[PDB]
Design a protein around this ligand. Sequence first.
Ligand SMILES: O=C(c1ccc(O)cc1O)N1CC[C@@H](C(F)(F)F)n2nccc21
Length: 208
Amino acid sequence: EVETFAFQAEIAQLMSLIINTFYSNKEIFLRELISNSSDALDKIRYESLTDPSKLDSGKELHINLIPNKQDRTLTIVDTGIGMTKADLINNLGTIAKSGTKAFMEALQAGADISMIGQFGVGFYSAYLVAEKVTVITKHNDDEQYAWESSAGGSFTVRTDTGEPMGRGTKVILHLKEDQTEYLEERRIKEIVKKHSQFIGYPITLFVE
Ligand SMILES: O=C(c1ccc(O)cc1O)N1CC[C@@H](C(F)(F)F)n2nccc21
C-alpha cells in the first residue's frame, strides 16, 4: 500500500536548509505553490491544445486555496496536469536535484530563500510553513496518488483511495503550530495579492 522513499541527498539537504535556516519571509511558500500549480495548469492546457480529451477529467483550469483551521491545513488545489507516480517520486515532476545545486550555488552567490522558485524546487518552500505536506495528484491515464512528507529524509507514496479529484494536484499543507496565519483569509488574500496577482488561472480563496 504505502511505499517509503528516501529523498535524494540534495533534496534532503534543501529541505533541512528550508526547515532549519532562519528566514522570516515564509509567505513565499504560497507563491511558489501557486506558481507550481500554474505551471501544471499550463501544462495541461498546452496538452489540451492538440488533445482536448485531456480535459475530459475537468475543463476548469483553476487553483483553489482551501484553509481549514480545524485540520490546520492550507490546501492548494489545482486542476493542472497532475503527476504520475513516476513524477511524484521524481521530485514531484521537477529537476529538483540540479535545481537544488543551482539554488545552493545561488545562495552562496548572495541569493535568499525567496528565490527558490527560479531553481525549480519552490515546492519545498512548503516546508517553511508545513510540518507535513501531503500531495494528492491525479494525472490522466494514471491513478490518484498521495505523496507525503514530514521531511526528515523520506517521503511516501501510496495509491490514494480518498476523494477522486479528476485531475490535478492538491497540496495539503499541515501547517506548523506557529504558522496558522496562513489560514487567515486576509493573510492568504494579502499574499496572493502580493505575490500571485497575475497568475493566469482563477485562484479561489475558499472561506471557512
Ligand atoms: O502537478 C504538479 C504540481 C506540483 C507541485 C505543486 O505544488 C502543484 C502542482 O500542480 N506539477 C505537474 C508536474 C510538473 C510539470 F508540470 F512541470 F511537469 N510540475 N511543475 C510544477 C508543478 C508541477
